[PDB]
Design a protein around this nucleic acid. Sequence first.
DNA 1: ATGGGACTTTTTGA
DNA 2: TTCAAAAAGTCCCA
Length: 544
Amino acid sequence: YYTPKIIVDYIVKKTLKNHDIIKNPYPRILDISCGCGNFLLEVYDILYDLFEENIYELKKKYDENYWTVDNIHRHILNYCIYGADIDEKAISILKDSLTNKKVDESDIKINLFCCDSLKKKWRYKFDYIVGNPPYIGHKKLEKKYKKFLLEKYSEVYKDKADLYFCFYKKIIDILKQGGIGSVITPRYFLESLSGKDLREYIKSNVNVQEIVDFLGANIFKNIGVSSCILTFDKKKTKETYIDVFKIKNEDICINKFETLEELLKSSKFEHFNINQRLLSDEWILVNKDDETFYNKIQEKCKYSLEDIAISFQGIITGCDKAFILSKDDVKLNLVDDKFLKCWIKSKNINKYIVDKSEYRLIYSNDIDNENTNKRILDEIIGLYKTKLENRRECKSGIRKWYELQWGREKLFFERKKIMYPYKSNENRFAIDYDNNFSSADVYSFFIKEEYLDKFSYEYLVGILNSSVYDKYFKITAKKMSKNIYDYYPNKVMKIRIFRDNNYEEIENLSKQIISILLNKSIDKGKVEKLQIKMDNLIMDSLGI
DNA sequence: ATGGGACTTTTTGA
DNA sequence: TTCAAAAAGTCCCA
Ligand SMILES: N=C(NCCSC[C@H]1O[C@@H](n2cnc3c(NCCCc4ccccc4)ncnc32)[C@H](O)[C@@H]1O)NCC1CCCCC1
Ligand SMILES: [K+]
Ligand SMILES: [K+]
Ligand SMILES: [K+]
């Protein structure tokens, strides 16, 4: 979890580069999760040069005996650097590092606190705040602790929110008037549904100076997280425009230049501005070309998928190894075919059509009692009885030990519907003809009856799989890792759709693609030509 | 050994 | 009663 030095230097320089040390020689710089002091040790170096370069001006303007170069080390540690961390071994190491910057005279007091930053009663605000807070999601966070966050941090922490939301809140709350904060956190709060309250909190309490979005790039080696750097202030400012630096190529190595600023100004990043006053509850962080593109589509389309469709998440068995068998597995001979459903994974979804299924789900909810079908329970499902019994609804009695945890409603699956993978590099919406069941890695919707005469499944997969809609969706989608976006209903169902003079031709092209994709000898190339023709029709329709 | 690519479970709050 | 969100993802190889 060590933050790379090139990022640490940038965040520290972002806050202190324009500090007027003559006007205020007592700046308070805080790291609320300082660890071993990746940031604070750099703050010390930057402060020391700042004081030494102006030592004679300070000696003249202020106590001429206090301001000597020999006194800078003590002054920094007594009045300027503040750290907090829950790990006492980390604080003990940082205290030793800060002491070793000078190399007892008299007992220098360092402002390091071993505590929970979210619980500490903070006695004063701070001029500058930097660091890299902990990230802990809803599954890994201790349940007794979550009761505390839901009580005391409800303005940013609810439901499936993350712990680092609370650090944004704490950092903002203890930032002095006119102060500057700069942190590196996961990027997901910029787009996620859970981050809505946090985005409202940031926008309405600080001026966001700058957002560095690394998208799917791997900033932390051997860590599966996607990062951003937020810089914000509480200055009295009227313009309130955000500098947004979005990475262009996710495969870039971060150390190509001596400094991060060189990387940002390079061709490896795009820069654009966003008006903070124009931010809705969603933050549309795109350049002017993309904003025009996005707005054209939004205004043109009179419907959304949510308007015309019923959406639902897939089956959640609660223990897949207990209920999912290969269709060639001999144990399926014990299971009556009335209990067996086709099962697909996200990899089975292509554009327009689903691979033939290779797995079967035992829809165990339809097993009436333990004595009629003893063989299935003893020889297939019962091999995982202990794990099945530990599921939440089994411990509370709502589920029998052999039942599916969230079996949903079979009738929603056993119908013509559209399916798409929950995480993908591109739009892949397929028409399911085979009553496929799936887990939560595949989402489904079917068309409401009253919209069937306006929209057909064949038309919908045509436009949703188009190049236009792939770009259109990815503008506001949640970037997860390198070449992975979330395709979840909370954004997929917000996709807006249109219907105009090109409807018949778009639908016809979609059927030709479906027909070719289902044939034995597939000449995939003609599909690409048809898709290009369809994309041109869609661009003609939307005026782009 | 590492960094990069394929692929994606069930726990959980509401 | 029962929905859907959540990557400090997870796992493997060359
Ligand atoms: N794998 C992880 N990676 C991220 C590392 S974060 C970097 C620094 O952040 C400090 N740090 C964290 N949480 C703090 C905090 N309050 C929140 C407390 C939340 C909590 C509640 C119950 C049980 C445990 C934690 N207050 C001040 N410092 C804090 C670390 O000690 C570290 O040196 N975190 C999970 C896990 C492991 C480290 C101990 C606890 C987190
Ligand atoms: K003086
Ligand atoms: K990443
Ligand atoms: K992992």
